[PDB]
Amino acid sequence: HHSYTWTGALITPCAAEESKLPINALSNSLLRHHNMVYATTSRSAGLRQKKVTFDRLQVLDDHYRDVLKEMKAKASTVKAKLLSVEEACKLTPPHSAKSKFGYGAKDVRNLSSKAVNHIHSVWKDLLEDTVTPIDTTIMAKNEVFCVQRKPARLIVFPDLGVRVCEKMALYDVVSTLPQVVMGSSYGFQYSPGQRVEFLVNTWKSKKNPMGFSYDTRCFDSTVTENDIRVEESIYQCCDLAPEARQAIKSLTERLYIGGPLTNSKGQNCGYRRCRASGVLTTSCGNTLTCYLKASAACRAAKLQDCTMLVNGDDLVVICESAGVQEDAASLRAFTEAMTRYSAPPGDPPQPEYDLELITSCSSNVSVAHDASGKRVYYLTRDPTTPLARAAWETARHTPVNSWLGNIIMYAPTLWARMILMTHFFSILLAQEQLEKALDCQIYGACYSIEPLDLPQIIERLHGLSAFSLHSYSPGEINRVASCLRKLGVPPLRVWRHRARSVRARLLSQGGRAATCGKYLFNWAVKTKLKLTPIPAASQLDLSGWFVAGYSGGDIYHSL
Ligand SMILES: Cc1ccc(S(=O)(=O)NC2=NC(=O)/C(=C/c3ccc(C)o3)S2)cc1
């Protein structure tokens, strides 16, 4: 019952890899301690293979089955539709991994006969073959981090022709079923502010609030064949077309459960018997299995009024405290249960009685004040990784601009406004690329966004308060200040100074550019403006922005 088996072939790169932070003329103005930023590469794939390769054991008791039966009863009320080959295609990212059968993402999006005929041949093979394992490619992701060096993560994905077929049979399911089964516990249905809201209201629901985060040690590797089959049984509970049921069954047996691993060179690296990180059901699967295991664990551990918030493999639990002494005990029992369900923790979970001290989705709740001086809760996080990535994207263009994604998700934060906004807008101005659409990610899905619409976007997601927050918490202030010293990032006084400059320049521009300068940097000027609502704000269709998670799902939404 090992998560993986390796032949011995190395996981090879499909192009040149950079580990050292690239440096240009704009680098120093943002970060000076360059040697602290790095990117993971193949050179460490070997190290990761050892950490994710182990034997999984499972003991399923009555609590587990009782929770599963409840989840299935809700799943039965779901009606999912089959997507046409045309629809699935328009959901394919413009720069997704090209197929090894004579066509690419560009051909898919354009509905090229070659790509369409191949996708149809794959779909037919799926309905007729429910046993032959589907091939997958294993790659070492190139992610940027700040020292303390972690080994590169592994991404496993099937050929483009298959990815389009997954969408057709499962897109609607992974987009609607999660919220029906888990209700308010499904995290991907909330925007940053809504997540904070649900968290605060829940915490205030308990007489004596007690919460903790649960970090599983390499969740994907703990996912067993049983878990993947249970996932399929839940999908099958939905009202689906017979053709969709067949495809879902086939994808499960042939791909989701396991399959052979092939490096970029074409060599078999081994076999997978755990969760594939690069399939459409990765987010939904991880969320359903994590919610199922934790729900049962809360019953085994005897937690009281346990409310959960699940986002893929990330779990948050808020319940009624029974005393600092009991909490610690129950929590330990919870862990044991989870472990028995094949979900061992990497780091021992610790009970918290302070909301702001609980970190989930790499983020935490915090408080600041708006113009009126009213206390306002917002979602923030440790800026280390976001800044390290900003340094990299400062000297190197990337497929996904994290700085943009981060601004959108953390616009109300001190670090995002003060540094990310000031820095990147300064650059956009110098290159006159303000109206140039850029790609970023939100819950794993890829979105094309124009920097000039940021003000309207932020208003819709966070509210005008995002443009006037001040007097942050000491805890937040120190964490930001510390990170700045660590990386060697200029102080507030510097950014404020640069912001007035960028602001004055944006105003001069006029139109959307003036709007950006007025709302995004109003915090820099001594004489703050009124900052009223924005007209075109409600013109964008931010519908599918916060519905579900698609991490590794190769999903693209044309905004
Ligand atoms: C993006 C932004 C930047 C600055 C402001 S503010 O008007 O100077 N009010 C603040 N409140 C704090 O908690 C702050 C942290 C803080 C205090 C001292 C240092 C170095 O950082 S500043 C507002 C918004």
Side-chain angles (χ1 to χ4, degrees), residues 413-414 417-418 469-472 477 492 496 523 528:
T413 71
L414 169 65
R417 306 174 63 193
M418 179 184 110
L469 298 193
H470 72 81
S471 304
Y472 292 78
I477 292 167
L492 164 61
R496 180 198 299 294
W523 55 267
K528 288 68 170 62

Side-chain angles (χ1 to χ4, degrees), residues 453-474:
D453 303 330
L454 274 170
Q456 326 178 68
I457 291 178
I458 295 168
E459 184 190 308
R460 293 281 295 296
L461 302 192
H462 307 288
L464 289 177
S465 57
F467 302 128
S468 61
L469 298 193
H470 72 81
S471 304
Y472 292 78
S473 79

Side-chain angles (χ1 to χ4, degrees), residues 207-498:
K207 303 159 187 174
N208 308 302
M210 189 288 260
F212 63 94
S213 57
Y214 191 86
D215 161 60
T216 297
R217 185 247 315 191
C218 189
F219 191 96
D220 287 356
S221 295
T222 68
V223 179
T224 62
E225 181 175 313
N226 160 87
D227 301 333
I228 293 165
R229 287 189 186 294
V230 165
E231 269 154 35
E232 197 258 23
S233 67
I234 298 176
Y235 305 146
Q236 288 301 336
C237 284
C238 297
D239 179 335
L240 305 146
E243 174 176 39
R245 293 187 179 288
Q246 180 72 10
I248 290 166
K249 167 171 172 291
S250 183
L251 287 170
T252 295
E253 291 280 21
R254 304 177 57 184
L255 173 70
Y256 304 150
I257 277 172
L261 302 169
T262 302
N263 65 32
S264 64
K265 279 182 172 56
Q267 300 170 308
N268 173 202
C269 286
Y271 208 89
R272 169 178 61 76
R273 298 209 169 71
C274 62
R275 171 85 69 213
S277 61
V279 294
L280 180 62
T281 48
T282 294
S283 176
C284 179
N286 285 346
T287 306
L288 289 170
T289 300
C290 178
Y291 171 96
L292 163 48
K293 295 183 174 183
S295 292
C298 284
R299 302 189 183 186
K302 295 172 174 288
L303 273 42
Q304 298 301 96
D305 190 12
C306 52
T307 297
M308 324 225 276
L309 184 60
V310 189
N311 284 72
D313 65 311
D314 193 289
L315 169 70
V316 191
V317 184
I318 291 175
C319 53
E320 282 286 356
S321 179
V324 51
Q325 274 312 313
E326 262 292 296
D327 295 348
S330 298
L331 225 189
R332 296 170 75 263
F334 181 87
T335 305
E336 270 155 38
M338 286 295 277
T339 298
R340 244 139 46 205
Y341 300 148
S342 175
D347 283 293
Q350 177 191 305
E352 297 292 349
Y353 305 98
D354 189 320
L355 184 48
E356 294 174 39
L357 297 185
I358 303 178
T359 281
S360 56
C361 255
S362 300
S363 58
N364 70 271
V365 177
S366 203
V367 56
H369 307 257
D370 57 37
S372 301
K374 181 179 65 177
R375 283 169 66 76
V376 29
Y377 296 98
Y378 69 105
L379 190 69
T380 188
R381 64 160 287 162
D382 183 281
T384 293
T385 297
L387 291 187
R389 291 181 174 178
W392 194 286
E393 305 174 324
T394 283
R396 281 268 194 291
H397 302 77
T398 58
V400 171
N401 298 275
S402 67
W403 68 266
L404 175 59
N406 281 315
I407 284 177
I408 291 168
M409 299 295 295
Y410 299 107
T413 71
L414 169 65
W415 53 274
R417 306 174 63 193
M418 179 184 110
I419 306 164
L420 291 184
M421 279 180 188
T422 307
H423 179 72
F424 289 99
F425 263 82
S426 170
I427 294 172
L428 291 184
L429 276 155
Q431 307 305 315
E432 289 167 356
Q433 307 186 312
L434 288 169
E435 76 306 70
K436 178 188 173 185
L438 292 170
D439 297 317
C440 61
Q441 301 198 315
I442 302 180
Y443 289 166
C446 180
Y447 298 82
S448 175
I449 284 156
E450 294 181 62
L452 294 174
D453 303 330
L454 274 170
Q456 326 178 68
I457 291 178
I458 295 168
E459 184 190 308
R460 293 281 295 296
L461 302 192
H462 307 288
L464 289 177
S465 57
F467 302 128
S468 61
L469 298 193
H470 72 81
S471 304
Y472 292 78
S473 79
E476 181 61 14
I477 292 167
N478 287 314
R479 182 167 61 177
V480 167
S482 304
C483 163
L484 301 194
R485 279 183 294 274
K486 180 173 57 183
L487 294 170
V489 179
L492 164 61
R493 44 197 170 85
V494 180
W495 292 109
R496 180 198 299 294
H497 192 69
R498 304 176 176 178

Side-chain angles (χ1 to χ4, degrees), residues 191-206:
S191 64
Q194 299 179 313
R195 181 197 181 67
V196 165
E197 196 189 315
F198 173 70
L199 275 169
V200 176
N201 294 333
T202 301
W203 186 273
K204 295 170 70 163
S205 278
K206 326 299 171 175

Side-chain angles (χ1 to χ4, degrees), residues 519-533:
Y519 294 72
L520 293 184
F521 304 103
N522 188 253
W523 55 267
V525 280
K526 63 179 66 174
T527 306
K528 288 68 170 62
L529 287 63
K530 35 71 171 305
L531 237 42
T532 68

